[PDB]
Amino acid sequence: GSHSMRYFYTAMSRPGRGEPRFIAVGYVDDTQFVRFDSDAASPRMAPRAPWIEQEGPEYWDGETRNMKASAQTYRENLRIALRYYNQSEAGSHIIQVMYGCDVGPDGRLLRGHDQSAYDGKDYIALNEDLSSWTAADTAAQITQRKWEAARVAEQLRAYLEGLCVEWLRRYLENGKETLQRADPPKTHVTHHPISDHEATLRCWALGFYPAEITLTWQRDGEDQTQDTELVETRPAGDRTFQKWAAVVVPSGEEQRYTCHVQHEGLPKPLTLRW
């Protein structure tokens, strides 16, 4: 399906350096649209995309109040996690949360998500049924029992099927110029000799949106997966993304190699060569 909305919370303890910092960020697809930082001079939910600015004061006041209350609760969760793992109050720890909804082309819910981590490890996740939980260890099992008693899965389900999808659909309309526009990569192959006997071929994809893309090298029509250096897709800073893939090839054999590019913005996959 077509689209996602996601909120990401990070809460970071720092004993001796004040209360834990709380940072919240919201995305539609690969476009960030809000932020909150508890360390800011004046912490508030703040716009990070043009199409959200039009929301009125009640929107912004409500999101700010929610994030402040969340920051308080996540401070308590850090204290709790300390007890569940028999940990001292001198170390620095992190809770992270990701939640949100995926919708298809017609805008109906495809699936919901709600996952939490402690110190970068899975802690507790809502299952795809939006009714049951997967706890990673015996500490998270305590949280599971509490959340089962308090019908937390039911609340999440009501939000994921209702408000999450409705607000996502509204953002997608308000931001239709950008959120509903794919920018195809601009592509080329560069050649960097390394010795008399070898050279690197590097296949580039630039200026594309959304981030999802496949770049692959074939030698004589056969995928070179094990022999390709492929860098992480990286943000350009103008909403768009860049990636490259490279292969070390024997001198004179460059024409046996072909770069293949798939992206939602392209009417069909591309084949390039040097």
Binding site: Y59, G62, N66, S70, E76, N77, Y99, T143, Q155, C164
Partner: peptide, 11 residues
């Protein structure tokens, strides 16, 4: 818009 439960879930 963020999830906003009446009582926010504690661990």
């Amino acid at each position: 818009k963020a999830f906003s439960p009446e009582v926010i879930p504690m661990f």
